[PDB]
């Protein structure tokens, strides 16, 4: 992006650039992701494939079409886009979790396996052996939902503050 006038156009550039975008998505750095997209020129977002694919993955992931995100696995412009697809699957699982523990009531074992695209059923225990949302009640996958006293001290602080700014001379 810097020595633009002097540097000759490098056709062997978009590959690494989009691979960087994929890396940002992989480590859930959405802010930096969109900053670099903005840095990129406008046309490349819709013309090139190397960049379009990471753009497509991020767009799908923000919409919530995780099924499309997964189905995109086979669709990869160049094999270089590797190991970040894997870190991206891991991060997607983490985000699916985030959803589950922020806003659900309880997910049974079969439905947890269905929703979270875990590893083989035997390792399906994964992410409960790792995150462990206080699981266990009734069925081991009860999800243990992770969902009134006057704050007298704080109210006293604030009211005293009113009095202080009203009585001080200024």
């Amino acid at each position: 992006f810097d020595y633009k006038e002097q540097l000759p156009e490098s056709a062997y550039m978009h590959q690494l650039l989009g691979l960087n975008l994929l890396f940002l998505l992989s480590q859930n750095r959405v802010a930096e992701f969109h900053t670099e997209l903005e840095r990129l020129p406008a046309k490349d977002i819709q013309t090139n494939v190397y960049i379009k694919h990471p753009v497509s993955l991020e767009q799908y992931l923000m919409e919530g079409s995780y099924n499309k995100v997964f189905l995109a696995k086979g669709n990869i412009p160049a094999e270089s886009y590797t190991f970040f697809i894997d870190i991206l699957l891991d991060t997607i699982r983490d985000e699916i979790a985030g959803c589950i523990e922020k806003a659900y009531e309880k997910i049974l074992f079969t439905e947890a396996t269905r929703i979270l695209f875990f590893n083989t059923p035997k390792k399906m225990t994964d992410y409960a052996k790792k995150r462990g949302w206080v699981l266990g009640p009734n069925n081991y996958y009860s999800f243990a939902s992770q969902q009134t006293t006057i704050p007298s001290t704080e109210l006293a602080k604030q009211v005293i503050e009113y009095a202080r700014q009203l009585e001080m001379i200024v």
Binding site: I150, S152, T153, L155, A156, V159, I160, Y162, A163, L166
Partner: protein
């Protein structure tokens, strides 16, 4: 209203002498009263100053007269009466605010009581409300 007096010798103001000499600027800081002048505050008797003498213990014992108890310090105000007072003061303040709008418009067009009354009323409302609210929180914490 207490005044101390002493007489003037008959051979003092008639022999050509002032009733009482003056060596310090102290004796002219208090003015006499016409009531006494008429009866002769300076023809037959003086007027000695008073200058009350108060220790440090008498003043405390007298302060005990109106000294407010910790109960009065920490006791809330009847909430019904407090709400009635809030309502009455806010209504009177509304009336003063209408008058204040009229006054500011009129003065800005052609070239105060509303402003001063509004200021005193805002003072009373804020002091009352803050005091009662803080007392309420203090009690909610102290008595549980």
């Amino acid at each position: 209203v207490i005044d101390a007096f002493r007489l003037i010798n008959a051979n003092m103001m008639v022999l050509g002498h002032e009733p009482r000499q003056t060596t310090s600027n102290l004796g002219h800081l208090n003015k006499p009263s016409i009531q006494a002048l008429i009866h002769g505050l300076n023809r037959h008797y003086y007027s000695i100053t008073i200058n009350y003498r108060k220790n440090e213990l008498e003043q405390k014992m007298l302060l005990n007269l109106h000294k407010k108890s910790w109960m009065e310090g920490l006791t809330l105000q009847d909430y019904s009466e407090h709400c009635k007072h809030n309502e009455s003061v806010v209504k009177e303040m509304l009336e003063l605010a209408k008058n204040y709008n009229k006054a500011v418009e009129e003065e800005d067009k052609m070239t105060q009581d509303p402003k001063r009354h509004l200021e005193e009323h805002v003072d009373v409302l804020m002091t009352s409300n803050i005091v009662q609210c803080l007392a309420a929180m203090l009690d909610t914490v102290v008595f549980k």
